[PDB]
Amino acid sequence: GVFNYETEATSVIPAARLFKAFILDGDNLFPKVAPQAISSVENIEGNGGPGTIKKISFPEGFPFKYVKDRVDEVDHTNFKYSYSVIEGGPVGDTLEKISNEIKIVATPNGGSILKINNKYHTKGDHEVKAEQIKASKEMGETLLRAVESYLLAHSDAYN
Numbered sequence: 527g528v529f530n531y532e533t534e535a536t537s538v539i540p541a542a543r544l545f546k547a548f549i550l551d552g553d554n555l556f557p558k559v560a561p562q563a564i565s566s567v568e569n570i571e572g573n574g575g576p577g578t579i580k581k582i583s584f585p586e587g588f589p590f591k592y593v594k595d596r597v598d599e600v601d602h603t604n605f606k607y608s609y610s611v612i613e614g615g616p617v618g619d620t621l622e623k624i625s626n627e628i629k630i631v632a633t634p635n636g637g638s639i640l641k642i643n644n645k646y647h648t649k650g651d652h653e654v655k656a657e658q659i660k661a662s663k664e665m666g667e668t669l670l671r672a673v674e675s676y677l678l679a680h681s682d683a684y685n
């Protein structure tokens with residue numbers, strides 16, 4: 527079955543620039559700006575569109591070794607990105623996949639709002655609990671803030 531979670535986050539970075547950096551260049555930026563959270567990102571297959579698979583490795587001491595993420599859809603106009611966690615970490619005999627969707631929306635103050643949906647697809651109704659969701663949210667926030675800080679400090683990056 528499916529467990530659905532929605533949340534929102536904010537940024538002081540305009541939507542298009544944040545999308546370009548945080549979504550379209552995460553394979554390069556995440557290990558650079560958040561080495562304590564992400565040890566490396568490997569492209570396994572594909573040229574960036576639907577079906578592209580990446581292997582995201584975590585540092586020593588983290589709960590999980592790695593996850594493999596698959597790009598589902600990328601909307602460069604509406605700043606929407608969909609991807610699924612398809613192997614590693616929590617995925618296995620109790621969890622088939624995590625299907626994620628992010629949309630970045632401009633605000634009039636020059637910032638943005640990130641609208642985030644995560645759908646956990648379980649095998650044999652193994653309850654997804656608050657603790658896993660909390661962890662995932664903390665990681666996403668850590669990554670967002672690290673990228674934000676980088677974009678604040680490097681004005682010529684991603685215009």
Ligand SMILES: O=S(=O)(O)c1cccc2cccc(Nc3ccccc3)c12
Nearest residue numbers: 531533535642644659662663666667670
């Ligand atoms: O989707 S993520 O890419 O991790 C993500 C990316 C960027 C910011 C996020 C902020 C809060 C929660 C997230 N994840 C989350 C995790 C579980 C349930 C609901 C949201 C964020």
